[PDB]
Amino acid sequence: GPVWRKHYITYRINNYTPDMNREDVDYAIRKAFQVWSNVTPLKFSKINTGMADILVVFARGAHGDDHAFDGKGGILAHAFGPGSGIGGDAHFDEDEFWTTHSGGTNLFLTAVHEIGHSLGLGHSSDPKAVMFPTYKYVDINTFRLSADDIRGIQSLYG
Ligand SMILES: O=C1NC(=O)[C@](CNC(=O)c2cnn(-c3cccc(F)c3)n2)(C2CC2)N1
Ligand SMILES: [Ca+2]
Numbered sequence: 001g002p003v004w005r006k007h008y009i010t011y012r013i014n015n016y017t018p019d020m021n022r023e024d025v026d027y028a029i030r031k032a033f034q035v036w037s038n039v040t041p042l043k044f045s046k047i048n049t050g051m052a053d054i055l056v057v058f059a060r061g062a063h064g065d066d067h068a069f070d071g072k073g074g075i076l077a078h079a080f081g082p083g084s085g086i087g088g089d090a091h092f093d094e095d096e097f098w099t100t101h102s103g104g105t106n107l108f109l110t111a112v113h114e115i116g117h118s119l120g121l122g123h124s125s126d127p128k129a130v131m132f133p134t135y136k137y138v139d140i141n142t143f144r145l146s147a148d149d150i151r152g153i154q155s156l157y158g
């Protein structure tokens, strides 16, 4: 698959989940981008106007792309690999209950996984990997990418 042919990447939060405080949503997303920028040459910037590379969206059901969300449970989010338009964008299922910790589905951890896809990673067979298919909560205070994750992203971006 493709990679981003540039190191300065922008994101915009299209809309905010009513589940969380807006500042917590901003924080979770910013910290998620930071995870990946720490291990790559990529720099992520939040923009408030115009078209961003990565649009962050909360939506439910069929929401205008090829893939409808499915209510509470099952699919938590999806994202599109590098490219123009919908490429890079990360969509979070509003039928989930997004939380700062483990009360519902953790937005930070979900966002790390989705951003990985936005940057061109597929899934990992390592259960320790953030790119493993199955969501599970981990202590976010001790959160780190696996060796499988770091190798994955550095093979794409150095
Ligand atoms: O992005 C996606 N890839 C997929 O295969 C689906 C299903 N998976 C999920 O909804 C999802 C979201 N986050 N996590 C997760 C996993 C492991 C650790 C972690 F921190 C978060 N899994 C599918 C394409 C709809 N969406
Ligand atoms: Ca895009």
Ligand SMILES: [Ca+2]
Binding pocket: 069, 070, 071, 072, 073, 074, 075, 076, 093, 095, 096
């Ligand atoms: Ca769902």
Ligand SMILES: [Ca+2]
Binding pocket: 017, 019, 093, 094, 095, 096, 097, 098
């Ligand atoms: Ca919700």
Ligand SMILES: [Cl-]
Binding pocket: 099, 100, 101, 102, 103, 104
């Ligand atoms: Cl919580």
Ligand SMILES: [Zn+2]
Binding pocket: 063, 065, 067, 078, 091
């Ligand atoms: Zn979507």
Ligand SMILES: [Zn+2]
Binding pocket: 113, 117, 123, 133
């Ligand atoms: Zn995935």
